[PDB]
Amino acid sequence: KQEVTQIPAALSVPEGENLVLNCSFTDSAIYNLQWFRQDPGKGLTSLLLIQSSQREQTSGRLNASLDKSSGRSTLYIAASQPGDSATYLCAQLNQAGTALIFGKGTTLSVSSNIQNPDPAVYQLRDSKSSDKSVCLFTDFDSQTNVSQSKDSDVYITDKCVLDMRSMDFKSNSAVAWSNKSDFACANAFNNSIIPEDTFFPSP
């Protein structure tokens, strides 16, 4: 009966933007709302708690609004950073109120701004296994999206942003490897939407 709806299910925005997380819920009367953050493979960290008696609740760059009449709630993240990327859960206390009912969550992705995109694919040297050639699509800007591609032996990871603090340098990277023969390493990414001037040096 009681339902908590979070929209959108997935949100991707460039860093530096303000972003909005929506949460709607059935019924009214006495309740509270609690927003949580969880990173992949870890627990839930409580971000904000809004009672029915309140309309606003803030904490740092987080702003939580509550409209009791319409049944809508909103989580504002001002000046989003890549460190804000996580899964955001909205939960409403039931009418008893003895338990907490959750929404399906919003997976937020805040893409880093790449100063000077230098997209390239480099093949790396092996270790414990013959063949099994691994290589790295790196230094592309945040607008680039990597595909899983089609092959029996080829695998491609999702994008991934690292930050070298000693150099003030961020860079995206996706990894591809395989154990087949017809597959040279660099041919995994050509199927995906890749920039035209990407550097493809042969090993």
Binding site: I30, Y31, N32, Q34, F36, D39, P40, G41, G43, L44, T45, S46, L49, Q51, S52, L89, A91, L93, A96, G97, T98, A99, L100, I101, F102, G103, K104, G105, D118, A120, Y122, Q123, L124, R125, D126, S127, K128, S129, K132, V134, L136, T138, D139, Y155, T157, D158, C160, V161, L162, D163, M164, R165, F169, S171, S173, V175, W177, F199, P201, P203
Partner: protein, 242 residues
């Protein structure tokens, strides 16, 4: 002052019983168990409004709980089923008032399989930076590849010389399936460590990637030819190259 759940990870054969522990030292009256599934959010299983009191939640079937004391609230799996492969979260709250919030534990990743023969430790290999990347960017990316492990109960970390590093590191948030159409698919996880070319060109610098794998206990029986995939650390190393 927090909620502690045990164990962090668990692998179960179908039909086995298992109890998930949850304790809190915050003198909270309310406690509840949840299970998290992909695309499902958190679903309530059981909750307790005090010692000796227990009520059913949204999905109580397959589980039972007890509240003998205020601090403890164990979750008992009657007969482990593959449909119970999930992440289980324990939460507590002080009382009835809406001014009080909920505090969650770290969770328990629990995987149920028909046969323990499906449990595999990861194979870890570090791949050294390419000469082309060093020449083009004056940076050197190391790639650590953990492949073939099941379940996805792994913790990857990088160690440069003696120190565990986080700067210049990013790991895949989720491991991928080597056979994506299978429930019991073995997984693969990668991670990158990027350093300066001059740091990598020092032959005295030692790079170590290790994956902590949570597998079987030493009490579980093992009738396979290969080594019992117990909880272990698999590592791979590389030295700098001038």
């Amino acid at each position: 002052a927090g909620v502690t759940q045990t164990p962090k990870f668990q692998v179960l054969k179908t039909g086995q019983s298992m109890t998930l522990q949850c304790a809190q030292d915050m003198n909270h009256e309310y406690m509840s168990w949840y299970r998290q599934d992909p695309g499902m959010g958190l679903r309530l299983i059981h909750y307790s409004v005090g010692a000796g009191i227990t009520d059913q939640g949204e999905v109580p079937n397959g589980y039972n709980v007890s509240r003998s004391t205020t601090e403890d609230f164990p979750l008992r799996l009657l007969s482990a089923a593959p449909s119970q492969t999930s992440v289980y979260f324990c939460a507590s709250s002080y009382g009835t008032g809406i001014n009080y919030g909920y505090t969650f534990g770290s969770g328990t990743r629990l995987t149920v399989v028909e046969d323990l023969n499906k449990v595999f430790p990861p194979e870890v290999a570090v791949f050294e930076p390419s000469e082309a990347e060093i020449s083009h960017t004056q940076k050197a990316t190391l790639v650590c590849l953990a492949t073939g492990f099941f379940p996805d109960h792994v913790e990857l970390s990088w160690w440069v010389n003696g120190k565990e590093v986080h700067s210049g590191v990013c790991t895949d948030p989720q491991p991928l399936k080597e056979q994506p159409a299978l429930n019991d698919s073995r997984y693969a996880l990668s991670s990158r460590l990027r350093v300066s070319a001059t740091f990598w060109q020092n032959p005295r610098n030692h790079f170590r990637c290790q994956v902590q794998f949570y597998g079987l206990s030493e009490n579980d029986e093992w009738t396979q030819d290969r080594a019992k995939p117990v909880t272990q650390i698999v590592s791979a190393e590389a030295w700098g190259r001038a």
